[PDB]
Design a protein around this ligand. Sequence first.
Ligand SMILES: C=C1/C(=C\C=C2/CCC[C@]3(C)[C@@H]([C@H](CCCC(C)(C)O)[C@H]4C[C@@H]4CCC(C)(C)O)CC[C@@H]23)C[C@@H](O)C[C@@H]1O
Ligand SMILES: C=C1/C(=C\C=C2/CCC[C@]3(C)[C@@H]([C@H](CCCC(C)(C)O)[C@H]4C[C@@H]4CCC(C)(C)O)CC[C@@H]23)C[C@@H](O)C[C@@H]1O
Lengths: 239, 239, 10, 10
Amino acid sequence: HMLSDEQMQIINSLVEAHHKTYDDSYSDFVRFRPPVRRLSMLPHLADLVSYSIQKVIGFAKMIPGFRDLTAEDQIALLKSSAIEIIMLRSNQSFSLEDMSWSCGGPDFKYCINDVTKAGHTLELLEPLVKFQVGLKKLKLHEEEHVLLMAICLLSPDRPGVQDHVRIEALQDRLCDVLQAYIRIQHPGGRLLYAKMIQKLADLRSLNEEHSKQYRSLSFQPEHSMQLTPLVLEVFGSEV
Amino acid sequence: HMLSDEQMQIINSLVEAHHKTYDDSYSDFVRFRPPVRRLSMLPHLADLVSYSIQKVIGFAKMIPGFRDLTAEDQIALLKSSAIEIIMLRSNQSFSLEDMSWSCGGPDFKYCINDVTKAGHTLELLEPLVKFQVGLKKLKLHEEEHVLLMAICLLSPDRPGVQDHVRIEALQDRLCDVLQAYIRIQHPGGRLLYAKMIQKLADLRSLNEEHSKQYRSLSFQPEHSMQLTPLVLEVFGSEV
Amino acid sequence: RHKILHRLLQ
Amino acid sequence: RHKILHRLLQ
Ligand SMILES: C=C1/C(=C\C=C2/CCC[C@]3(C)[C@@H]([C@H](CCCC(C)(C)O)[C@H]4C[C@@H]4CCC(C)(C)O)CC[C@@H]23)C[C@@H](O)C[C@@H]1O
Ligand SMILES: C=C1/C(=C\C=C2/CCC[C@]3(C)[C@@H]([C@H](CCCC(C)(C)O)[C@H]4C[C@@H]4CCC(C)(C)O)CC[C@@H]23)C[C@@H](O)C[C@@H]1O
């Protein structure tokens, strides 16, 4: 009925890491290519994703145990889960009132038709919105939110990983922390952990849909030239 | 003492091509990553060069005879001369009064210390400025300016070209047009053609200095990630 | 490779 | 390759 010292330190490290890598003011966005509303929004969103990947990488290197993995496994986990971590962390900006990502005034408020001007269709954009709504309804504590990101990144079931035994070992330790935290520090969360694991499976399908929409983008040189070097390297298949 | 019909058509095509690929208002620059004044200006200048490369490519495809070359020779000529054409066309924006490239108000006025915040040193920046001043003093007509760009691009002496015989053939035809135009349409230009050929040799040395400064940039991944896909492809050596 | 250049050259 | 990722991972 009480969190251990080690489980607390793991929680302290993740919350600090997330605070070190997420700006609730979104003030770096003026540094991106400005949004325009023929894939009109692609340059801005590419800069947005490239920026978030650097933040996910910063967050990952502070997950306990991650830096002990080989550089190969770190890359393997980063490449496969990068888009899933981005969809998870974007929930902090998602607003239920306007059903969009409100990162600013008119410019940085990202609604559905804006992602359309980036190679995606209204139809395939549907499960992303539903995922964000259901995730928003869980009203996760920062600890639960940050623990879910770390668990997602440390999935042993990624194409590329080698020491899946030890990545699974690290992920289960984090899953133990989340279960204990929910049980002893979240009132009325009797089914929350199960629901969070459900969102992870949803991210897998959203990940696969992005994978295919991205192969279209990266195969058209006039669109892939709009991407950034980091995006092409993280979402490329040149392992 | 009179321009031929063919020499006029070659002049008409180049002036139209340059007018189709150079904006004297520089209004697309708000679409670049904004300038900031640790290689602070690099993202803006990278977007600037990437944009100019697309314009040089557009200009090149309208040079008479260029489209008849193989795609290999076109790439070979583009990759070797891209930075030289950029330095030539930038002279239209270079102002002698402030010794800078005045493409806007405070933001898009590019002085010496701004290029320093892009991996270049004050010392190596010297021949670029002297080149621009001497080029500005020639007071070239648009025809002479646009003819010099086409002659530069069609140099048979580039690493990579194959049918150097026919690229040399195209370049000499353009050199004939420039000599004839200067002789019959430019008063007091008795030595202008010789001076323009001198500027071409100067571009070769500026090109080699950029080549080495760029290898430094492209070998540091934290800097090369700031570049664009087009820049890395044009200035890369993966032929 | 030169995929972008090939594309930009129409 | 993965030069950027290797660099960003310190
Ligand atoms: C990124 C963040 C923020 C907001 C995050 C958004 C809103 C904007 C659109 C983003 C960035 C989506 C991408 C964009 C395209 C990606 C490239 C061009 C590489 O294909 C679409 C594929 C997903 C659509 C679903 C589908 C069809 C099934 O694939 C993922 C997260 C979204 C803002 C702030 O909260 C910080 C946070 O880091
Ligand atoms: C580009 C244009 C304009 C202006 C053009 C400028 C002013 C800004 C700086 C630019 C763009 C210089 C580059 C920049 C860095 C390139 C990357 C990052 C790839 O290394 C420096 C290497 C040259 C320094 C000399 C040296 C040391 C010997 O290498 C070339 C032309 C310059 C504005 C307008 O006129 C349109 C025109 O298209």
